[PDB]
Amino acid sequence: AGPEMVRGQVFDVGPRYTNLSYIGEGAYGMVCSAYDNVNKVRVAIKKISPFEHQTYCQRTLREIKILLRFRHENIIGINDIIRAPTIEQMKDVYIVQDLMETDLYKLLKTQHLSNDHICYFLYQILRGLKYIHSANVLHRDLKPSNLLLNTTCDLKICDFGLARVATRWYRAPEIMLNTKSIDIWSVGCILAEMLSNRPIFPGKHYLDQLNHILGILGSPSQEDLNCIINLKARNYLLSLPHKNKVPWNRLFPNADSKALDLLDKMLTFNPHKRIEVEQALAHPYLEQYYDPSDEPIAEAPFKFDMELDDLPKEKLKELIFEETARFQPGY
Numbered sequence: 245a246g247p248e249m250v251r252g253q254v255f256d257v258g259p260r261y262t263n264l265s266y267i268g269e270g271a272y273g274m275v276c277s278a279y280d281n282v283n284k285v286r287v288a289i290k291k292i293s294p295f296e297h298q299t300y301c302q303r304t305l306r307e308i309k310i311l312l313r314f315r316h317e318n319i320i321g322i323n324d325i326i327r328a329p330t331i332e333q334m335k336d337v338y339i340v341q342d343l344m345e346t347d348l349y350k351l352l353k354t355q356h357l358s359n360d361h362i363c364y365f366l367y368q369i370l371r372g373l374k375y376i377h378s379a380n381v382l383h384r385d386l387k388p389s390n391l392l393l394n395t396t397c398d399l400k401i402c403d404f405g406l407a408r409v410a411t412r413w414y415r416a417p418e419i420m421l422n423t424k425s426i427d428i429w430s431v432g433c434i435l436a437e438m439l440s441n442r443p444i445f446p447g448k449h450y451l452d453q454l455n456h457i458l459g460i461l462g463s464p465s466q467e468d469l470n471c472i473i474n475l476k477a478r479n480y481l482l483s484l485p486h487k488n489k490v491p492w493n494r495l496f497p498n499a500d501s502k503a504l505d506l507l508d509k510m511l512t513f514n515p516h517k518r519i520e521v522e523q524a525l526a527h528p529y530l531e532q533y534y535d536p537s538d539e540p541i542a543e544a545p546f547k548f549d550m551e552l553d554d555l556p557k558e559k560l561k562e563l564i565f566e567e568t569a570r571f572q573p574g575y
């Protein structure tokens with residue numbers, strides 16, 4: 245027979261994983277679902293080809309190391325990793341993970357959410373984020389397609405390729421004008437998107453991203469623009485005419501007033517004044533779900549043993565080969 249082929253990509257994951265079906269592709273690689281003949285369930289398999297680029301090698305190693313350390317209901321795990329028997333033959337890495345039903349991006353394209361479901365999904369996002377932040381880790385790329393959902397509305401955060409120890413539509417202003425507050429801004433954008441089924445700040449480019457933000461928040465104050473900022477971005481913001489602030493209730497007239505109060509606190513221009521994860525979980529909007537006795541935190545802060553940014557890609561490939569050795573049948 246041979247290895248299965250999907251949308252031009254070889255998925256060399258047999259004999260254990262068969263009956264492959266395409267899910268999607270993006271900067272993370274290509275994801276298929278497959279039948280696991282050992283556990284007798286369908287799983288997700290992500291194929292990555294990172295070895296030609298130092299940056300892609302860093303991302304692959306960071307994701308593996310973080311996801312194999314983390315253990316939380318609202319965070320995707322890694323169940324298995326497939327790669328070649330020798331480092332010379334290793335060109336691709338297959339990360340096997342729990343298969344979910346859909347992601348929030350696809351769900352929001354076809355479904356109107358009830359207030360109770362928006363509240364429940366926001367709670368799960370924040371519960372997972374509380375764990376990530378408690379480990380001194382930033383996700384850095386929270387968006388609807390990175391939030392996975394199963395048939396019983398369990399939510400898991402995935403894609404830790406850009407995660408670090410503490411689409412541009414979900415990027416915080418401080419990222420564009422230059423911490424944990426960058427993830428809170430992304431969560432605020434996702435909340436706004438759940439309230440209206442449309443992105444709140446759909447910029448076509450960086451200047452347009454700034455214009456969409458100021459279009460709702462209004463012109464930034466002197467305090468908002470006093471810190472370290474890119475000179476070009478500061479000059480651009482100063483060259484703009486005054487913009488009025490749009491009240492949240494005008495943008496989301498049918499939303500729960502408590503949801504808009506929390507939205508206001510997450511979508512704060514100044515990161516020093518933006519609400520933190522624990523305070524967001526304790527907000528009255530989340531009162532029905534908030535359960536501090538059932539919101540685990542990391543046992544210790546996450547730490548990489550080596551300076552990964554400094555390592556040549558050949559060294560990173562050896563570390564990836566070493567990290568994945570434990571999954572080799574038979575180790």
Ligand SMILES: O=c1cc(N2CCc3n[nH]c(-c4ccncc4)c3C2)cc[nH]1
Pocket residue numbers: 267272275288289290320341342343344345346347389390392402403404
């Ligand atoms: O890193 C990553 C990992 C990703 N996935 C692999 C894990 C997973 N389980 N279920 C799904 C799924 C996604 C969409 N519709 C149905 C199921 C995925 C998607 C995606 C982006 N980035």
